[PDB]
Amino acid sequence: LYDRRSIFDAVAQSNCQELESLLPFLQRSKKRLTDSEFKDPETGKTCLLKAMLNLHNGQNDTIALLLDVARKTDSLKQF
């Protein structure tokens, strides 16, 4: 299982492992990386955007994984 907080922390430290079980989670719950619940309720920030702020050496592959997940559910464009 994953809440907003869980992923945002993973992203903060460029961890591509804690997101191993990610894709299969919102396959079961059919939740979308774009759901109301996966954004900050007052800014509209998403994990991809958290990743965009949490750069280390202009790099983050949580991005590459995060995008990849969004196409597999094709949240892709709006994500």
From Swiss-Prot:
Record annotation: effect of changing residue 45 to A: Abolishes ATP binding. Abolishes CALM binding. Impairs normal desensitization by repeated exposure to capsaicin
Modifications made to the protein after synthesis: Phosphorylation by PKA reverses capsaicin-induced dephosphorylation at multiple sites, probably including Ser-6 as a major phosphorylation site. Phosphorylation by CAMKII seems to regulate binding to vanilloids. Phosphorylated and modulated by PRKCE, PRKCM and probably PRKCZ. Dephosphorylation by calcineurin seems to lead to receptor desensitization and phosphorylation by CAMKII recovers activity.
User: What does changing residue 4 to E do?
Assistant: Abolishes capsaicin-evoked current and binding to resiniferatoxin
Which residues in this protein are found as Phosphothreonine?
34
Q: What does this protein do?
A: Non-selective calcium permeant cation channel involved in detection of noxious chemical and thermal stimuli. Seems to mediate proton influx and may be involved in intracellular acidosis in nociceptive neurons. Involved in mediation of inflammatory pain and hyperalgesia. Sensitized by a phosphatidylinositol second messenger system activated by receptor tyrosine kinases, which involves PKC isozymes and PCL. Activation by vanilloids, like capsaicin, and temperatures higher than 42 degrees Celsius.
Any notes on this protein's domains?
A: The association domain (AD) is necessary for self-association.
Name it. Transient receptor potential cation channel subfamily V member 1
The organism is Rattus norvegicus (Rat)
Output the lineage of the source organism: Eukaryota, Metazoa, Chordata, Craniata, Vertebrata
Coding gene? Trpv1
Question: Which residues of the full-length protein are shown here?
Answer: 111 to 189 of 838
